[PDB]
Amino acid sequence: GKITLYEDRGFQGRHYECSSDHTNLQPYLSRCNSASVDSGCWMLYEQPNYSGLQYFLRRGDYADHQQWMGLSDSVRSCRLIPHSGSHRIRLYEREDYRGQMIEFTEDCSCLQDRFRFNEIHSLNVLEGSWVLYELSNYRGRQYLLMPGDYRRYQDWGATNARVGSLRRVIDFS
């Protein structure tokens, strides 16, 4: 994967190219107001060490941070999300894999049309990577979900358990 991050809007100013996860972009990039994603799928984080608000980016030329839903020019760490052709995720009503469960192998734009609970309190990412969204139609806060087991919503970096939609992470293929 390859992403070029720019300090100023419209692909202007100083820039930095990433091909792997970076824990702290600030020494290499003082602020981020535009980005060109040449390949791969990327998660941008507002703070270093993959903390704070998250934003998912795919190939394309984002002329302003608002175009990736970012509300500021603070982009201080980033992850390259490995592509998968197959995806599977299991969502649970309660913590520790308890209560009612629903499984997805495809995107879902409105979880509440499919599942009774607005809150998801644990989940298993069985295959591929996903982005979960706080609101329906891929809106609200975003959380990157890579393969693994998550016993509590805080395990995916959220401050509440609300999930309204979810998307498979796929590069061009």
Side-chain angles (χ1 to χ4, degrees), residues 40-59:
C41 302
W42 293 85
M43 212 77 189
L44 299 187
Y45 297 83
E46 195 270 330
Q47 289 293 309
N49 259 10
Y50 318 117
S51 184
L53 294 166
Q54 315 183 21
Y55 302 97
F56 180 56
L57 281 71
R58 293 180 72 233
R59 296 196 196 187

Side-chain angles (χ1 to χ4, degrees), residues 12 22 68 81 88 154 163:
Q12 297 293 337
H22 278 65
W68 61 77
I81 309 159
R88 188 178 300 268
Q154 63 165 241
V163 179

